[PDB]
Design a protein around this ligand. Structure first.
Ligand SMILES: CC(=O)N1CCN(c2ccncc2)CC1
Length: 121
């Protein structure tokens, strides 16, 4: 139908916008601490601690499958990356501090995205 095409056009444009957000967010992680899933060969008991792992690569996979229906779903996954890290790692680690910095700096990008999503429909 024409409506389904229109809808898919909107989703495609959302995906274009979220891909830009994702690249902007990943820039704020230059050490690339959050680029890939935490390795179970490197952290065998990770899943005993963290029940919903997340990372930038996994987000990108869902993104390209147009699996984010709105900005809120995308933000949920971003928050998972940060919150998982701030629980698994102690306050005085380079990991915890990297999450804090990624959180604080990412806030600007996400503030704009919320307004762009709202204004452009
Ligand atoms: C994202 C996150 O929490 N981490 C990623 C890096 N990491 C390891 C990497 C290599 N070996 C052991 C651990 C644990 C902490």
């Amino acid at each position: 139908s024409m409506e389904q095409v229109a809808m898919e056009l909107r989703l495609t444009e959302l995906t274009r916008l979220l891909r830009s957000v994702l690249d902007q967010l990943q820039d704020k992680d230059p050490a690339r601490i959050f680029a890939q899933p935490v390795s179970l060969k490197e952290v065998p008991d990770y899943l005993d601690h963290i029940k919903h792992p997340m990372d930038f690569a996994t987000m990108r996979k869902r993104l390209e499958a147009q699996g984010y229906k709105n900005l809120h779903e995308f933000e949920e996954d971003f928050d998972l990356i940060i919150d998982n890290c701030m629980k698994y790692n102690a306050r005085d680690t380079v990991f915890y501090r990297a999450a804090v910095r990624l959180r604080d700096q990412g806030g600007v990008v996400l503030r704009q995205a919320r307004r762009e999503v709202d204004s452009i429909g």
